[PDB]
Subunit: 311 residues, 5 copies
């Protein structure tokens, strides 16, 4: 088999469409997601023209091996897609209607800067390489682009699934390549992070601040050190759900900042004890009373600054 | 091969059945379950009809490649099913009896609102796409729907395996699609959650309340802070067995509420110490004595409210 | 190809045998084990009979596709077995000797009631479905049932590998099915549980009982609470190696009971301190002295009761 | 195709060789290792003999399907090897030279008695089953046994890769079987265990012994209990890297013994406090001073005894 | 098919090129990385030469089976590459242009000495084995070596992708082997290690040094022991992201050194308490005041020494 011949000198247009059936396993650490979808392809092959009068049938059904099929691949996939041909329908003029159902693990970079209040644009890049006899170009059939109503991505809200209609045509290894960008817009369901991570982290921090209403050094050391250890546990828990980033994430910034609050609280607790042993409790009382206001105030202002810089 | 031709204009009815052999790996985080079952298919192909008295044979056995077989797929599967054809039998009138044994990983959303006292309806969606020559519709042969007595799903009780007899017929990408809903009703075996999570979580909370019978601030801080850390460990353990939900689960609600009880207990312990240092122990005694009743009473009432809102 | 015709009306007997080469990956949580074995099949096919004199051969070798072979399947497997045909030999009377080497992941329920001092009976269910032409029945060739001397299952002792000679013949989807039960009896190597879990768990519990020889409330709170946290860690460790069961396991029962001992120890420590503060130490001394005997005695008797109920 | 006929009655000798290209993933828990190697096979087939003078060709190249090839398998593999034929060459006398590149996951038991200062002998068992026409025997071509210079097994030192030249010939299921033992000798790189596990474990134990220079019961309880919890963490960490063994490992023996030292240290701390409360500090001082010498001395002697019993 | 015959006695030159499409999953523990790339091959086959005038074409497109193709393999891969042929083109003089898209898991040793401020040279080794008929040698077509601009390796910066132009020609089992070294230079994005591991580890260590401004032994024991436990948690966390090395890593050296600082801090805290109990506090004050300077000074100098030895 060889590609369809050009009537003039034009490239062969392969109309494409992706219909999402299932979306699952969005792995934040791996920056991957699994997809199960329909891939529709359409091109004119005049060598397959037929008379419905002679053949009896109005539409011809072919096996993939019997006819020429464009070598369509995905750019951003771990391994080649697991594909099963559903139908190959050829109409009298030679217009081929190809339909396959596929499953693939897609590589798509994620921006964690606003985590867990982040939104992402997942990409599925469709590609075709031009052959010697003729250049192959990709197009989007908007009528064949969509998603099933039941498509759910655990821990995410699906906003839209659209395609950039204009392909990216470029030279690669002395041949033309036609690339299409299918975009799946999603927003993270931040809900569960509030009762599971955010609020427990705030509770332990506020518990450490009870040391500002205590003169007992040994109880203060227990309050600040124990809650710090619990904060380390939450820091470790958060970083297990995330990849290592060359930038600070919103959660990472708050988590890091809270360490400074624990560190200054230890200094205050140390300074307070030192002065009381030195028979200067009036002075220790001034520092402790100021800390009761300073710690929640500086914490509120620093969080307003952080929220502003990130959102 | 081509589909059987219609006698009038009727769609081709493909009778279906699923017989469960094995049910395993219900993954709560992934919202998947693995299945090993028999898939039975039945349709009329008049081009295959034969005389019973002339032929001598009452049934004719065909290889899948020798005859036309409807392209039956599962909607909610990770990858295409691993299938092996068991038998193909044709009766004199041309009624085809198809049987295959398959294995598949099924995507089925789970409602965790009542966890670990939750019940689920797992779905297996059967689908057929119509051809240009004729429309293909699915039907349920109730005699061929069932499950093996030995079918066990670890940590779950299997209630029923039924099929919604009426298919969901709809247009998808300019062709008819016939969808059947096979439902596997299950209820969670909550047993183990009681001695492993619920009771140990209650024991540590009740241990924190012993601080209401102690005047020792240093020991009280140790009691409330250490038990809170153990509660954080149980919160982390519970969330590792569950996916992130855009709603509160029953267990999640209790776990979150218990943090408030630890927080108020720290306030009480702080207030008690502060008053004793201020030479007001008669007062600290009134707050401590009230706390001995208030804490278990508010805990009981809040749990009755939560159980009512969730069940 | 079609099944061998009956001389009278008798069912076709397929003699079976399983020879274990490798046993590995017994997953307690998944209730699975992997197997690598020889599967031997034997049946009479008169159509393949030959005379040794005119043929010059005492035996005839065939390719699987050249002759009829019974569709033998495993009931309790995750996916269909990975099989490679080793040999197909035909004797003059048409007696076929089939041999394949296979690998499979087997689903077999485990009884954890006596864990880690439990014994299991793993099952490998062989099955054949009858055809319209004739009924196919399975039999056991005891001479072809066995295991390699080097067969080792990590963390387990292999007792026996036998087959229930009488098949379970029953109707499934209007066709008769012949099922054989191959049983692999194993006993858990409990050894490592003693120095790694049992003894460390007993040491921390006995350490909490040193509080009965101390009047220091602050030190007592530290002793009981810290060891309880270590007991929670062991409870979590044990439950990670086990699936969730709708019954109590022997280890689970001891682990749960130990929480009650920690809870009563906290009450004793609280009662002791309360009385001392109330200027009643003579009385606290009576409760503490009684606890020194009561705690180890009640622990010994409760363990005798538990061991009796479980073994 | 059929096997080469014997000139007299001799068995067919299949000369073998394994050349290791890659060694990776030595899984201690699973007792497996992955291998990527060349498998070389050589045997005489007189039916393939040719004249080198008239043919003008010294060697003939065949495709696997064109000639008879012995069914060579591995005994100790999870699944059948993933093999690709590299070359088949036939000399004028009919000597066939077969070469394939394969990858396999090998099951090989490990002796953990001396862990992490252990050495292992990994096995790769080559096997051939005799055919009815003739007996097949295996041999080692030492000229075709070896390993690539770059072969590295992470966390291990590769000593040698040799083959036991004499095959193990035995009857299995009424046929002869010829088995070869390829041995890969390795020694564990214990280096990292010293700064990561051994020394931190010794530091915390020596920190618990500072309680022998303290009269403060509350601080002593904190010293011994906190370090014991850290020892439990190291015990858990060590057991996660190891399978469960029906014997004591060297590390396991030390870890278990250290618990006894923590237990006796708690007794000493309890006895010391009890005597001081009883107004007997002169006596408590004698026990504490003796403990300062006894604890490190008994620890040193017990470790010498353990090292002697294990090495 | 047979290899192209030599015009004189020259070896067959196979020009190669690798164009990286995707780089993902750099596993530090496994010392592997996954790659998705184009593999280009070019060689002269005179038997395929044609006249452009006579044929009416300037290029000839073949199927892989129709012509001779060199058996090109990767040395350092887990399993054989997953490859799909994209195009095969023949010029009039018999110059073959082969293009395939492949995916492979590559084994490449990593030097962790400078972790997490390390740089690596990942290798992809291309190999060809000579045939009895002729010697095959590999070459690099620099015009066909490169990478896509979007190629990202999570947690790493990609510096360059170059090839060592001269192959490593050597004998392996009496046949010439031609090996090419494709090098992917990467540098670790150390950023996240600073707020997640380095700084929290420094904060807890500096918190342990507050004990040098405290005379309270019980609070000092709590300060040093609790922070040491948190340091053990960070040591465990770091070692889970790394394989076991027969050398010290930069992070491993700092982590190990910090244990010595905790150990000496416990000695100081013990010595201080012992002297105060012995009625020698003036002396304890001299040791404590010296420790306030000695600990941060020795820590700074030891870190300068370590940074110098490692970088
Ligand atoms: C009687 C005073 C009641 C104080 C209630 C505390 C309000 C906490 C609000 C939390 C918001 C979520 C912020 C945490 C610090 C709490 C201060 C501890 C109480 C001080 C006791 C003084 C004794 C007179
Ligand atoms: C009033 C003294 C303020 C001390 C501020 C501490 C500086 C910490 C620098 C951190 C660098 C990152 C290095 C940690 C030691 C901190 C010493 C604790 C304070 C001593 C109390 C003395 C009471 C007069
Ligand atoms: C510790 C600090 C507590 C965290 C503070 C909340 C973070 C935040 O401010 O979150 C804000 C995001 C809103 O995001 P948005 O509109 O999608 O972003 C795009 C916005 N632009 C385009 C205008 C830049 O989510 C929320 O509605 C937060 C609701 C949860 C409150 C958590 C309370 C605890
Ligand atoms: C901390 C709070 C302790 C937890 C309280 C039990 C939760 C509950 O109330 O559980 C209730 C569920 C019953 O569920 P149901 O009838 O299937 O629900 C559907 C009901 N509708 C249709 C009427 C809405 O389970 C049980 O029988 C609980 C038995 C275990 C007792 C645990 C003691 C600890
Ligand atoms: C002598 C009084 C015995 C108290 C027994 C405690 C009952 C606990 C019931 C648990 C139910 C499961 C609820 C936990 C609080 C326990 C209070 C501790 C005792 C108070 C000491 C006062 C000394 C006179
Ligand atoms: C905390 C309490 C400590 C645990 C007590 C041992 C459990 C037990 O009693 O174990 C009993 C099992 C024996 O089982 P069996 O004969 O196979 O069972 C079938 C018996 N029938 C058929 C008669 C019912 O193992 C042992 O030999 C235990 C030896 C290890 C001692 C552990 C010391 C710590
Ligand atoms: C001088 C008394 C020595 C006591 C030795 C302890 C025996 C422990 C046996 C463990 C069995 C395994 C059972 C744990 C409680 C230990 C009691 C603590 C000592 C009491 C101090 C009294 C000071 C006179
Ligand atoms: C806590 C106790 C600390 C552990 C003591 C070291 C273990 C040991 O004694 O290790 C010994 C092994 C040597 O092994 P070998 O010669 O291969 O054995 C085969 C010997 N036969 C054939 C003679 C029986 O390693 C070493 O060289 C130890 C060097 C590391 C020192 C660790 C310091 C901490
Ligand atoms: C002035 C005494 C300095 C003591 C130095 C401690 C040596 C530690 C050797 C570690 C080997 C690795 C062995 C751990 C016990 C430590 C003893 C604590 C010091 C006792 C204080 C006495 C006050 C005069
Ligand atoms: C505890 C000790 C704190 C860690 C000290 C930093 C490590 C270091 O010194 O890191 C040095 C590397 C630079 O590496 P380079 O130039 O690529 O190496 C090759 C250099 N040759 C060729 C000259 C040998 O990173 C940095 O730029 C450090 C920035 C991070 C600061 C961390 C603050 C905490
Ligand atoms: Cl693809
Ligand atoms: Cl399917
Ligand atoms: Cl099977
Ligand atoms: Cl094999
Ligand atoms: Cl390869
Ligand atoms: Cl050489
Ligand atoms: Cl050569
Ligand atoms: Na084609
Ligand atoms: Na068909
Ligand atoms: Na304390
Ligand atoms: Na057959
Ligand atoms: Na062959
Ligand atoms: Na070829």
């Amino acid at each position: 088999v060889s590609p369809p011949p050009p009537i003039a000198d034009e490239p062969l247009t392969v109309n494409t469409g992706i219909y999402l059936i299932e979306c699952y396993s969005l792995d934040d650490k791996a920056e991957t997601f699994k997809v199960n979808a329909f891939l529709s392809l359409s091109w004119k092959d005049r060598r397959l023209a037929f008379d419905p009068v002679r053949s009896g049938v109005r539409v011809k059904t072919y096996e993939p091996e019997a006819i020429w099929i464009p070598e369509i691949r995905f750019v951003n996939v771990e391994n080649a897609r697991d594909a099963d041909v559903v139908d190959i329908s050829v109409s009298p003029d030679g217009t081929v209607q190809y339909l396959e159902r596929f499953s693939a693990r897609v590589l798509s970079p994620l921006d964690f800067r606003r985590y867990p209040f982040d939104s992402q644009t997942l990409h599925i890049y469709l590609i075709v390489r031009s052959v010697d006899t003729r250049n192959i170009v990709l197009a989007v059939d908007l009528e064949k682009v969509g998603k099933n109503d039941d498509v759910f991505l655990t821990g995410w809200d699906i906003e839209s699934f659209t395609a950039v209609v204009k392909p990216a045509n470029f030279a690669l290894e002395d041949r033309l390549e036609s690339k299409l960008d299918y975009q799946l817009r999603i927003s993270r369901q931040y809900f569960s992070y509030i009762p599971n991570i955010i609020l427990p982290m705030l509770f332990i921090l506020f518990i450490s601040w009870t040391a500002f209403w205590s003169t007992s050094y040994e109880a203060n050391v227990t309050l600040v050190v124990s809650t710090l250890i619990a904060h380390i546990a939450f820091n470790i828990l958060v970083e297990t759900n995330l990849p290592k980033t060359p930038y600070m994430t919103y959660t990472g910034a708050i988590i890091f900042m809270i360490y400074l609050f624990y560190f200054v609280a230890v200094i205050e607790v140390t300074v307070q004890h030192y002065l009381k042993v030195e028979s200067q409790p009036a002075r220790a009382a001034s520092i402790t009373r100021a800390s009761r206001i300073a710690f929640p105030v500086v914490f509120l202002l620093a969080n307003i600054i952080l929220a502003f810089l990130f959102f």
